[PDB]
Every structure is written in C-alpha cells, then in structure tokens.
C-alpha cells in the first residue's frame with residue numbers, strides 16, 4: 001500500500017504542458033525519501049511544506065501534475081509568476097502549498113531533427129485560473145474579423161510545438177516537471193508518512 | 196483591439212515559427228560546412244529555401260500593421276526589420292532581370308580568368324594565381340599584366356550589366372520611398388530612437404566625411420613613407436611627388452597595404468613577435484587555445500562557454516574523410532546553440548583568431564536575451580569591432596607574458612613596437628581611403644551625380660585626389676573597374692569596413708580607461724578587468740534593441756564616431772613617420788601618371 005510516486009516521476013511518457021496530467025495520491029503510505037534523496041533533480045523548491053516534516057504529517061490528497069516544458073520556463077512554475085506557461089498552460093495559486101520538481105530530459109525527449117510532439121498554448125483570451133487546463137483547438141481570433149475555423153489574418157491556431165534537438169542550449173532543452181500539491185484541510189486525511 | 200496589440204500577437208507567432216525554421220537552416224548549413232556532400236548541399240539549400248519563403252510571407256504580413264500607430268519602439272524596431280522586403284516592390288519581369296544581372300556579375304567574377312600575352316595558354320584565375328601575383332610579386336610588368344587583364348577581360352564584360360543594375364536598383368529604392376540605392380544602403384545607419392539618439396541616413400555622409408578629414412594627415416604620412424620605400428623597389432616608375440601606381444599596392448585593388456610590409460619594414464633586422472614556437476614547445480593544442488580564450492573572457496566578467504560549444508563545435512579539421520570549410524566562422528545556430536568552425540592550427544595567428552571569434556560567440560550569447568529580430572549588432576559595424584578588440588588585447592606582450600608564451604623578462608623595444616604599428620597601419624589605415632572612395636563613387640553614381648560617360652573618369656580622378664593612387668594604364672568607359680572588386684559585383688555595401696574601424700578603437704580606448712591602463716593604447720590588455728566587461732556587456736546585451744547611438748554611448752560615452760581613439764593608437768607611428776618624411780614630400784599630385 002505504498003504511494004505510487006514511481007508511476008509519476010519514473011513514467012516512460014510525459015505530457016504536454018497544455019494537457020498537463022494529474023494523478024491522485026490518496027489512501028496510501030508515502031516514501032518521501034525517494035524524492036529528496038535522488039540528486040537527478042535540478043529543481044526542488046517547496047512553498048508551504050517543510051520537506052522533512054512531511055513524514056510526520058498526513059494530507060487528504062496529494063495531486064501529482066506532470067508535464068514537459070523548456071528549461072528557461074521552469075521558473076514560471078511558481079506562485080506569482082507570469083509568462084506564456086503560467087498564463088496559458090499551467091497556473092499555481094499565490095497561496096500554493098507544495099513542491100515543484102524538475103529535471104533535464106534531453107536524453108529522452110530530444111531527437112536528431114527534433115521532437116515536435118510536446119506542445120504549448122501560444123495564445124488565449126484570458127489567463128488560466130489556478131490549476132486550470134485548456135485543451136481546446138479553437139482558432140485564436142486576435143482581431144475583430146471572425147476566423148471561421150480556417151485560420152488566417154489575425155487568426156491563429158492557439159497551440160505551438162516545442163522543438164527539442166539534442167544540440168539545443170539548456171534554456172531551450174526539455175525539462176520534465178512534477179508539481180506535488182498537499183491538501184491538509186476540509187477532507188479526511190488519508191496520505192500519511194511512515195511516522 | 197488596437198493595431199499595436201495585433202502586431203505584438205503577430206510578432207509572438209512569428210518568433211515561435213521563425214526561431215525553429217531559422218535553427219533548422221543553421222543545422223543543415225552546419226552539416227554541409229562540416230561534411231561537404233551533395234546530399235547535405237540539397238538539405239542546406241532546401242532548408243534555407245523554406246525559411247526564406249517564410250520570411251518573405253511574414254514581411255508582407257508585417258506591412259499590414261502601420262508603424263505610425265505603434266507606440267512601443269521595441270515592437271516598432273521588430274516590425275521595421277521585418278517590413279523591409281526589397282525587390283518585392285518591383286515588377287516580376289524586372290525582378291527576374293535584376294537577379295539575372297546579379298547572378299551574371301557574380302559568375303563572371305568567379306569564373307573570370309586572364310591570360311599572359313607571353314604563353315597564350317597559361318591563363319590564370321583570381322583565386323588562386325592572379326591573387327598570388329598581386330600579393331607576392333615584385334615585378335612591375337608581371338603585376339601590370341594581372342591588374343590590367345583583370346580589369347580588361349572581366350571589367351569590360353561587367354560594364355554594360357552594371358549600368359542596367361544601377362537603373363533597376365535605383366527604381367527599386369525610389370519605389371521603396373528612398374531617393375536612390377545609396378540612400379537605401381545608408382538606412383542601415385538610420386535610427387528613429389528617442390531623444391538625441393536619432394540618426395539620419397544623410398547624416399552618415401557628414402560623419403564619414405568629417406572623420407575621414409581627420410584621418411587624412413595620418414594617411415598622407417603613411418603614404419609618403421611607403422612611396423619612398425617603394426622608390427627603392429621600383430625606381431623607374433615612381434614619382435616622389437605623385438600618386439602611387441595601382442598595380443603595386445600589395446593586392447589586386449590596393450584594398451590593404453599589408454603585403455608591402457617586406458618592402459616598407461622600418462627596422463628589418465628586428466624580427467616580429469611570434470609565440471608559435473612557444474605554443475609548440477609547450478605542447479599546446481586546439482583545446483588549450485580555446486581554453487585560454489574562454490579564460491580571457493572569464494577574466495573580464497563574461498560568461499564561460501557552453502557545453503554545447505565544446506561538444507558541438509569543429510575546433511579542428513575533422514580528418515575522418517570529411518571535407519570541411521576551414522574558413523574561420525562563428526555561428527549562433529539559434530536556441531542556445533553557439534558553435535565555431537575553425538580548422539585550428541597551433542600558430543600565433545589562430546590563437547588570435549580564436550579570441551576574435553569567441554567575441555562573436557559572446558556577443559551572440561548576450562543579445563539572445565532579446566527578441567529574435569532584435570538579435571544582431573546595433574549596426575553592421577559593431578560585430579567585427581567586438582571581435583577585433585579581443586585580438587588587440589591578447590597579442591599585447593603583457594597578456595602573452597602572463598599566459599606564459601613570452602618570458603617574464605621580455606624586451607619591449609621601441610623599434611619592434613614601431614614595426615608593429617606599421618603593419619597595423621598598412622592594413623587598418625590603408626583601407627580607410629580605399630573604402631570611403633569606393634562608397635562615395637557608388638553613392639554618387641546612384642545619386643546620378645556621376646554620368647555614365649564620366650564614371651571611370653571620376654573613379655580615377657577620385658583615387659588620385661583621395662587615395663593617392665594612379666592608373667598604371669589609361670582607362671575609358673569601356674571599363675567598370677569599381678566592379679572588379681567582389682563586393683561591387685556581388686552587391687554588398689562597403690562603408691562597414693570604415694565604420695568598424697573607428698568603433699573598434701573607441702571601444703578599446705574606453706575599456707582600457709576602465710582597466711585604468713597606464714601608457715600607450717597599443718599595449719593595452721583588459722584582462723582581469725571586471726569593470727570593463729560590465730561596460731562591454733551593457734552594449735552587447737542590447738543587440739539591435741535600442742538605437743546604435745545609445746549602444747555606443749553605453750561603451751564609449753559618445754553617440755557618434757570619433758577618430759581621436761584610432762589616432763592615439765597610431766600616434767607613436769605618426770611621430771616616427773613625420774621625422775622620416777621631413778626630407779620628403781608629404782602628399783600627392785593628381786597629374787602624374789605612369790604612362791604619360
């Protein structure tokens with residue numbers, strides 16, 4: 001009855017950021033040691049949660065949101081941040097309590113000639129609400145002229161593809177990300193540490 | 196809602212699609228240049244075609260957003276850079292002819308060959324062969340056959356094409372709201388800017404002419420000195436108060452006097468400083484050379500190189516079986532991909548090249564914080580000036596000592612310093628007249644101030660008066676000699692080489708004042724100055740984001756060209772030259788000619 005973190009971090013396939021994947025970690029015993037021990041992680045920042053005290057504690061739910069973005073965007077996955085990713089792909093609330101973990105994926109998610117399978121939303125009429133998800137393909141009407149679904153002048157398909165070639169720089173390189181949200185109120189605590 | 200908002204959105208979409216298509220062109224261009232195969236020729240051609248087709252479409256689309264309603268200057272700059280299309284305004288029948296002329300002129304230059312009256316079967320091409328003569332020969336007549344033959348077999352063929360080229364190009368500019376093709380070229384120095392940082396295309400001429408005024412006394416004395424020394428080599432054909440014959444200047448045109456060094460060397464017994472032997476004796480390699488270069492930028496506060504650079508660059512001729520281009524090229528492939536292709540040898544020159552090309556990479560790396568379209572130098576003169584200040588510091592005897600290639604006890608002698616500043620003058624100061632005069636002629640042909648009936652009369656009048664240079668053989672209007680130089684047959688502006696030069700030495704003088712240099716500027720190394728690399732990086736950061744006036748002011752404190760820097764580098768030689776030319780005439784007569 002362990003909590004399945006290796007199903008999130010050690011997953012073979014990751015998601016695009018506009019279609020970020022969410023997994024519920026509920027009613028289970030948590031091995032946080034795997035997370036903190038591993039030195040593969042190039043980003044491990046927690047807001048609201050003390051990484052050590054988690055073993056002592058219990059939370060009703062732990063959500064594991066996974067996606068792929070590029071290295072110079074990893075900074076956007078944090079409270080108060082602005083940007084394409086924060087505004088149009090994946091938003092964290094300003095009162096966010098949890099941890100953000102990222103690592104370099106160039107060995108897996110990059111390809112000679114490029115891997116254009118991971119995408120992101122370039123335009124959107126409004127900024128995403130905290131933990132919102134937009135999988136719509138509707139043509140972005142920037143001007144007053146209706147687009148009629150074809151796409152054209154001032155009328156753009158709203159999703160663009162990252163291109164990941166192994167020779168890119170670190171800020172243009174693929175980064176697999178995991179956001180762990182810890183919820184300690186308004187439901188019966190079910191995810192406990194080993195303590 | 197507003198047009199500016201639509202433009203920002205337009206630009207954001209462009210940037211995402213352009214960055215990847217540009218990058219893909221760079222990648223295919225790199226695989227051809229490091230693996231010369233027919234397969235990679237196709238893919239380089241095909242990838243640059245898709246990108247070129249994309250860039251044109253976007254330029255037309257960009258014109259749809261009117262610049263008048265764009266309040267953001269950074270958005271404005273990007274739209275401007277995109278909106279300029281070129282020959283697109285011309286009718287398609289015209290446009291095909293213009294490219295027919297252009298491709299013909301370029302092929303004539305590349306496939307042109309001249310034959311010696313003696314041995315009517317030994318015909319030679321420019322590269323190699325004629326170019327060898329014009330750089331290494333000390334025979335008056337041998338060099339004359341080459342100079343006249345080039346301007347005869349190739350220049351005469353190019354004459355009618357060039358006259359058509361002027362008319363079509365002039366219309367293209369007139370249609371694009373420019374007075375002439377020359378005004379069109381001079382827009383690369385235009386800047387709308389905010390307050391005090393605007394620059395008019397006409398103002399470029401003013402500033403080129405006032406500054407060249409100030410270079411003239413230095414050029415005269417270098418010219419008088421070379422004439423005297425050449426009088427010993429060519430006594431029958433040199434007049435001590437006259438211009439110099441154009442076929443005796445050290446290359447096919449006299450664009451650099453660098454190869455007159457053997458014959459003009461002030462102190463021939465004193466040898467030049469060449470750390471080549473040290474590097475070989477200390478078992479240096481390409482890797483060490485580039486590591487020292489990275490250390491030089493690290494010493495001033497700049498970025499280390501990227502792991503990609505080290506992993507992905509060609510810093511040595513491949514061997515394997517791969518044919519490669521070995522011309523030293525710094526790249527920026529896009530997207531944090533920063534590479535150099537040098538077939539690096541363990542020589543002082545390639546040591547010095549590495550420092551220049553990594554000053555490219557380092558400019559590349561600082562302006563990559565900028566929108567794709569605002570990621571170049573502030574003008575066409577800034578980029579090679581940044582590389583140049585890096586060869587200047589690294590060849591100083593003090594750097595070469597500190598890094599262990601010159602013994603700690605090295606004799607800096609006044610004679611070896613003068614012999615240096617001469618070789619520099621023959622390259623750097625030599626070209627400054629050649630450059631200005633080419634471009635004045637073109638600017639003035641394009642304005643129509645030079646009739647076609649007088650083209651090559653004013654050409655050679657102007658070489659006489661300005662460059663101090665005279666026609667070996669007389670030449671009529673059956674000739675286009677302007678256009679027996681690459682850049683003129685292959686439709687490239689030339690004043691970049693003049694503008695580079697004045698910037699170069701303005702940048703060095705200011706970085707060397709922040710490193711608090713005591714003494715002659717020709718001996719300045721900026722190594723270990725964190726303050727200098729701040730000022731440098733405050734410019735390099737900007738790219739083409741702000742006016743070029745403001746980019747200069749951030750290094751140098753001044754919004755325009757000043758030649759006072761250049762002159763102070765060379766003031767050592769000026770003094771020597773004047774005393775060595777005191778029992779000589781300084782200047783030229785426009786009248787003498789080798790033939791009459």
Ligand SMILES: *[C@@H]1O[C@H](CO)[C@@H](O)[C@H](O)[C@H]1NC(C)=O
Pocket residue numbers: 005006007009010034035
């Ligand atoms: C992934 O696998 C490695 C090695 O098999 C293991 O050390 C690590 O704990 C795993 N990660 C997770 C999240 O369980």
Ligand SMILES: *[C@@H]1O[C@H](CO)[C@@H](O)[C@H](O)[C@H]1NC(C)=O
Pocket residue numbers: 226230232233234235
């Ligand atoms: C050279 O190009 C050929 C195709 O022309 C390719 O198969 C080969 O792998 C390339 N070699 C290298 C090392 O780039």
Ligand SMILES: *[C@@H]1O[C@H](CO)[C@@H](O)[C@H](O)[C@H]1NC(C)=O
Pocket residue numbers: 267268269270
């Ligand atoms: C111009 O637009 C850019 C968009 O990134 C914005 O950051 C900037 O503040 C705007 N203002 C000016 C005048 O630079």
Ligand SMILES: *[C@@H]1O[C@H](CO)[C@@H](O)[C@H](O)[C@H]1NC(C)=O
Pocket residue numbers: 499
């Ligand atoms: C890059 O610069 C940093 C910061 O000084 C330095 O610690 C690091 O060792 C340098 N990288 C190299 C040369 O490995």
Ligand SMILES: *[C@@H]1O[C@H](CO)[C@@H](O)[C@H](O)[C@H]1NC(C)=O
Pocket residue numbers: 494593594597598720722723
């Ligand atoms: C920079 O300082 C270090 C330590 O003082 C010295 O070894 C090195 O030679 C200096 N570099 C230069 C060229 O000033």
